[PDB]
Amino acid sequence: AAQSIDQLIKARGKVYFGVATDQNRLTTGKNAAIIKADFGMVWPENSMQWDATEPSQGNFNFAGADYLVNWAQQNGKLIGGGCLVWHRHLPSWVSSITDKNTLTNVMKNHITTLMTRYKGKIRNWDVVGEAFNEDGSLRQTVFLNVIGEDYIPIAFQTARAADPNAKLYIMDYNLDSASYPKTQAIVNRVKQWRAAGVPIDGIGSQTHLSAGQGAGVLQALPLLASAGTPEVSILMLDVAGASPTDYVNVVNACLNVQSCVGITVFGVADPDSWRASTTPLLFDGNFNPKPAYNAIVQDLQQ
Ligand SMILES: O=[N+]([O-])c1ccc2nn[nH]c2c1
């Protein structure tokens, strides 16, 4: 039987090798079996996003998120949650809010309700996602436009109050190159926020790579770590082509960075990827471990 990359990465001092999933993955294919055997943390693919959890103001949908949380607890898995404040999965009703006080309270209520429901059960909460433009300026989302840049500090202070046990993360993508301005920009702003006591515990890099981009993460992840958060993480990892070299490079970036607590892949098997044509995950369409998985196993040998 294949070795567990979660157990192997733990044996090297890390916290987890995780995977995104949800109810209908756990009831189909071989996902439940693979997650039970080989992964140590689960994230909700969709079921904790805003459009899934608060489809109208103050009215929440927790059946799907509850299923995942329960399954994780039944199978001794750590749980990540998110994203609490993210423009991409925002219902239209949030986008129409124009009053600063209203959106602030709406955003706080969304954060507090989700985090309170799972209080003490969630290791990591991704509180703010994709807040940056590619040039490193702040993305002009409804939260920035209506609340202003204080929405990020407010989001994290609210999260800390709701569940002090959780590690609070900001996440973004295209943080994979140390020379890309987005990567330095998130570092700059997180240093500034943490100097102001904002409880940003982690930076999570949503790592969607093209073939050959794994090597650059060996420099970009330490740069993210230079922001001084207690933790950084690789999130939503997938790699077009799934070359062993790309994946092992990302893993060794994690191993190289003392503050990097672990890695989360963006699904179990290729056909369930949002870019399945690029066969970018660690298991194929027959749920067989791919060369990249075996290479991670060998790279993590002690
Ligand atoms: O690391 N992930 O795969 C993952 C999936 C969904 C999320 N929502 N917020 N953060 C997330 C991370």
Numbering used by the authors: 2 to 303
Anything the authors wrote about it?
Here, we investigate the molecular origins of the nearly billionfold rate enhancement achieved by directed evolution of the computationally designed Kemp eliminase HG3 (7). The Kemp elimination is a well-studied model for proton transfer from carbon that has served as a benchmark for de novo design. Although the first-generation HG3 design is significantly more efficient than an “off-the-shelf” catalyst like bovine serum albumin, its specific activity was further increased 200-fold over 17 rounds of mutagenesis and screening. All HG3 variants have an inactive conformational sub-state, rooted in the original protein scaffold, which was gradually supplanted with a catalytically competent sub-state as evolution progressed.
One conformation matches that seen in the corresponding complexes with a transition-state analog (TSA), and presumably represents the active sub-state. The almost identical positioning of the catalytic residues in the free and the TSA-bound forms of HG3.7 indicates that the active site of this sub-state is already primed for catalysis. However, ensemble refinement of crystal structures for all the variants in complex with the TSA points to progressive increase of the active configuration as the key contributor to the catalytic enhancement. Increased ordering of the Met172 and Met237 side chains, which interact with one face of the TSA and likely stabilize the charge delocalized transition state through London dispersion forces, illustrates this trend. Although relatively flexible in HG3, Met172 becomes better ordered in HG3.7 due to shortening of residue 84 through the M84C mutation, which enabled a stabilizing interaction between the terminal methyl group of Met172 and the π-face of Trp87. The resulting conformation helps to position the catalytic base (Asp127), which samples many unreactive conformations in HG3, in a single orientation with the geometry required for proton abstraction.
